[PDB]
Design a protein around this nucleic acid. Sequence first.
RNA 1: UUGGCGGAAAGGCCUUGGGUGCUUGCUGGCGAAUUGCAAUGUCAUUUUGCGUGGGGAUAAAUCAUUUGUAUACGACUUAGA
RNA 2: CCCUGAAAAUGGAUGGCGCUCAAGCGUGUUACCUAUACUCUACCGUCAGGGUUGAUAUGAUGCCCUGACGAGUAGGCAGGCGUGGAGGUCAGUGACGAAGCCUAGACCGUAAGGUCGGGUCGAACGGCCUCUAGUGCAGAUCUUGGUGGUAGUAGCAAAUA
RNA 3: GAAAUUGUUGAAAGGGAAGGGCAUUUGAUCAGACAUGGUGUUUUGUA
Lengths: 127, 48, 106, 183, 197, 111, 167
Amino acid sequence: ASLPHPKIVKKHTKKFKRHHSDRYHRVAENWRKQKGIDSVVRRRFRGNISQPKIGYGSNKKTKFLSPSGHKTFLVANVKDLETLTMHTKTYAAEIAHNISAKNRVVILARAKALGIKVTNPKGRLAL
Amino acid sequence: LRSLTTVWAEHLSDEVKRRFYKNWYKSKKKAFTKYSAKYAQDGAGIER
Amino acid sequence: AESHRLYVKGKHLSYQRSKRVNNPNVSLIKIEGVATPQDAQFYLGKRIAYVYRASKEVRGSKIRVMWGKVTRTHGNSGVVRATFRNNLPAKTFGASVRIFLYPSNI
Amino acid sequence: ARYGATSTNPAKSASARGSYLRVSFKNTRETAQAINGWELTKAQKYLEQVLDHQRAIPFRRFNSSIGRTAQGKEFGVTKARWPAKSVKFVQGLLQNAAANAEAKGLDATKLYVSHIQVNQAPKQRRRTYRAHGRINKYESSPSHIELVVTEKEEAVAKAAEKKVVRLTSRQRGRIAAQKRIAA
Amino acid sequence: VEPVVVIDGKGHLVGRLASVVAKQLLNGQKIVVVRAEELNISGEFFRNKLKYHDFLRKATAFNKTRGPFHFRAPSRIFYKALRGMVSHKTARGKAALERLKVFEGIPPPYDKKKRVVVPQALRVLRLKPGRKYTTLGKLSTSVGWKYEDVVAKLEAKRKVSSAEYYAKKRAFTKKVASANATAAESDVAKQLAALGY
Amino acid sequence: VAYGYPSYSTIRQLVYKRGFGKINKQRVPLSDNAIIEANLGKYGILSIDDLIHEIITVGPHFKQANNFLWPFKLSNPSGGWGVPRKFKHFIQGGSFGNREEFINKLVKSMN
Amino acid sequence: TAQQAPKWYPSEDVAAPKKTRKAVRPQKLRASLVPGTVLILLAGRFRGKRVVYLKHLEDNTLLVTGPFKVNGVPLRRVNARYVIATSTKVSVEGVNVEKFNVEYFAKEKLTKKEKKEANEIKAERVEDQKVVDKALIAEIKKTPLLKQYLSASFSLKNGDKPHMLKF
RNA sequence: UUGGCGGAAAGGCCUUGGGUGCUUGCUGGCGAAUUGCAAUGUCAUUUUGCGUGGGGAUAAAUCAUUUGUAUACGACUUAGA
RNA sequence: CCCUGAAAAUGGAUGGCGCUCAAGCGUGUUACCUAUACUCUACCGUCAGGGUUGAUAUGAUGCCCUGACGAGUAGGCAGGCGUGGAGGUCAGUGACGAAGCCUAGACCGUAAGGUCGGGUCGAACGGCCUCUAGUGCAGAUCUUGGUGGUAGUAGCAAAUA
RNA sequence: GAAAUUGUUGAAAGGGAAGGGCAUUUGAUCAGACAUGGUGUUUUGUA
Ligand SMILES: [Mg+2]
Ligand SMILES: [Mg+2]
Ligand SMILES: [Mg+2]
Ligand SMILES: [Mg+2]
Ligand SMILES: [Mg+2]
Ligand SMILES: [Mg+2]
Ligand SMILES: [Mg+2]
Ligand SMILES: [Mg+2]
Ligand SMILES: [Mg+2]
Ligand SMILES: [Mg+2]
Ligand SMILES: [Mg+2]
Ligand SMILES: [Mg+2]
Ligand SMILES: [Mg+2]
Ligand SMILES: [Mg+2]
Ligand SMILES: [Mg+2]
Ligand SMILES: [Mg+2]
Ligand SMILES: [Mg+2]
Ligand SMILES: [Mg+2]
Ligand SMILES: [Mg+2]
Ligand SMILES: [Mg+2]
Ligand SMILES: [Mg+2]
Ligand SMILES: [Mg+2]
Ligand SMILES: [Mg+2]
Ligand SMILES: [Mg+2]
């Protein structure tokens, strides 16, 4: 249903983990660059973790594309979803976490009426 | 050197087979009882 | 007949490697009966299947297959380089592998 | 309420617990692990034999630099002790749980200790006095102990999933040929 | 090409045979070596005796039970010479060493199977005539191997029995050759010759 | 550097396979006579063979013709360098120096 | 709102492809494949069976018959890349293979809704096979042992080296 | 089924008799297809459990007590129907 | 070339194994192995040179064409991610469950980070354009508070019982 | 009602550390795409 696109290529699927985030608990996994003078990671010794850098940039024709082939868009109520009326083939709507179940029902009903794809048509569904 | 076979006597005294038990007082004392049955025929299992 | 083999036997030796660095994307294969690149030149382009067994049944069988091709000769003793859809698990070093006769050229 | 993680039938189970018990945590843990999954009367008899040094509690985890004993052979271990205090508290809770099971209307004969756990309780701190006028902590390690008894059941169930299968066309042809050439 | 390979160790060089067997093991071929006491080492006897003695001196200072063990049996000497030829500290190495069995003399069932030799590791084809060489069994007994006499006795017995075996085999093959000769100069033999058989 | 006297075949090979012009400070592949017409039409050069002839026969406009060509980007020789060690003079059995006429084989291998 | 808006949206119109210049022209099949040569099947149900080659079809394929009477391989279509051409030659003049073509073999795939686990042949295929093979075996019966040769199955033995073998 | 030989890790080798299936040594007849143009196209052994029905046999060790040829505790040596 | 000359302390090192018409030494010829090196291709970014105001439709700081280039501490600059609070807007979310917390469940971004699914929870919170700062932590024998291993360990033995 | 730390249950590995990088086997677990417009009425609620 999505607009046709080339094959999706990422060049690096592994999340970049902060050095020694696996060794000390106080070192969070959020990536920080090592500014040490004798740090092997900064000196890029063979056998150590790879640092994030611009060479891993994604293809501009592929950037921000979901595996389904759409660009994700956050929606908060019915009025926002009407901004995607003529853009079904490229954008997909996603209900914000802070949306009540009753409002989610009408959101999903409207999206199905207009053929808008919904990434999470299961949030807060009672069954 | 390796031991290949062992041939025992037909009858054993009480004192010798007590070596084979860590608790002689509560036991059936069935030591070499079926080996004793290897005798009672001339030489079948022993002379061989 | 008693023999139903339509492939030549091979042994997965090692990955492409230097002293300290190996490249899992390329594998080295030794074919029985080949001792020179000129004879191995016949065997390029053939399909290679690695046949292993698993406990869990996937789609009706205990047998799962790795499919790959030879790319070029290697060295002066008829060893060849082979690549697969998925690189061999590196536990198969010295395991027997199957080299078929297709695509044939004769 | 709100016991630990259990997988039993709550209708066929009875529970008892104790909170803030001034008794060494490590000894209570090692005691509890000694009777886990045991038959109730068998466990009580075991505890009685422990109190008079006829059997011992094998210390698996909290056992550094303790002695050895020949009574650990039963458990294939060499480090065992006789923590009387923990034994007394545990058997008190066992009596309480048996009484609760009797109240619920359980047969009192196929009960086994299905669940039991010991976790640390808040410390009770005192002062100890060291050389050169220094002061160090001196506290107890109390325990929260909880256990659930359950009747032993027969074989649970059988007849698992149907295990649907998908066959290729060529596999279908192979099976058809095999069934045709055979019976 | 073979399930297992039995190599007759007589007349071979320790180092070259060791390298060949190591490469075969790393390739996945099961190997068993027999008659380790007839492996030959290039060089005069006293030279390798001094080499082994210098090897003996090397041991852990503070505890001799955990130092380099100095095995004395010829099979064990070969096994040591081969073990440093393989990355034995890896699981691949350990599996590779598990495919090898090194034997003194020619033991049971391997006595009834065909033995093979490695031409590129043989003494006669590798050593210039006039060069001195050693016999592994002699060196091993010089450095402490105890069982030279028993293996000699057992090999004498084995050689005798194999001699009666080969006598019968030759007798039967003579009949086979006579029958084949009679069956020749017939049509079938003529098209076999015409087609190369 | 390794240098020598090139042949007509070798220069033809270079200009055909790796032929790039310096047009407005850019490296444009030739691939067509129109580019050479536009950029060298002043100096009587009209086709790629005109460039070839201006090279091999060092003409009055050899300087501009040569400076027009972007420096050739050659690969490593296909058959190898022929010698075990490179950085000694060709007379010493090395690779650099004035290998006067054997440069044709080396350049063909490297192209 | 949760996510404000994209200022520009990509165009929804699909573009046409460029004019491809890859024309199609027929195969240059290898010279060893001559109508009437004996082949070996390297793959499929009938792998290893020695067979006869008849005609080069339009979808870059070879028409093949056993003969079905000798070994049980019927009129079947194969691909030249999975067979080996022998030096044994069978004179195939006098047989009308022009009737067979690509649409002579159609599969008639069933609807996905209908799936059968329990489970036939067309009579016309049977009679064409019976006509063709009875004409061929008139010629195979000339050369001795070749009927048995076709009944036999190809198989590699120990010591066979295909790079040095001849077919 | 008969008889030998083999103890280096024998655990195998040879041998008598009869029966049985096959035999492409040679000549015939019938079947193969649809797995649709290839997708290892599954055929080996390794261990265990549960069932059947057929034989075969009905123990010890430890704790506890005791000893002192032993001992920090373990351990060792003893003894107790 | 080899040998004597040639003696030091833990056991030991042509890297090890081992190597004698060598797997040693001098020399020649090839074939082969491989670096983040060279050739080509794709993609990311930067820089440079160019095209494109025509009506209709979005972004002229937009879109597009061409070539080259890409290491880096101290340091400089630029573009961005995030936090507390202010103005404006989305007549934004919300007791039919906001914030917070947990989640080898998912998605997006090279990344700073953002979004969702599930559990807990009960009262406030967010996106965007700007303003403002007591705005981003692993170190400072950092401050305060809490918790471990050591460890059921050292030990609880003067003053006769 | 977070973390350090601990208890219970489940999974897994463990021959003088563990932790990490590349690739893959094996196990566990997870998403998407599989309506498309359309010939068309072999049609029911007849559009
Ligand atoms: Mg951490
Ligand atoms: Mg430095
Ligand atoms: Mg200790
Ligand atoms: Mg102590
Ligand atoms: Mg004090
Ligand atoms: Mg004081
Ligand atoms: Mg080459
Ligand atoms: Mg070189
Ligand atoms: Mg000297
Ligand atoms: Mg070397
Ligand atoms: Mg030399
Ligand atoms: Mg490379
Ligand atoms: Mg909430
Ligand atoms: Mg976590
Ligand atoms: Mg309130
Ligand atoms: Mg501050
Ligand atoms: Mg901190
Ligand atoms: Mg710092
Ligand atoms: Mg501090
Ligand atoms: Mg103490
Ligand atoms: Mg004191
Ligand atoms: Mg609270
Ligand atoms: Mg925690
Ligand atoms: Mg240890």
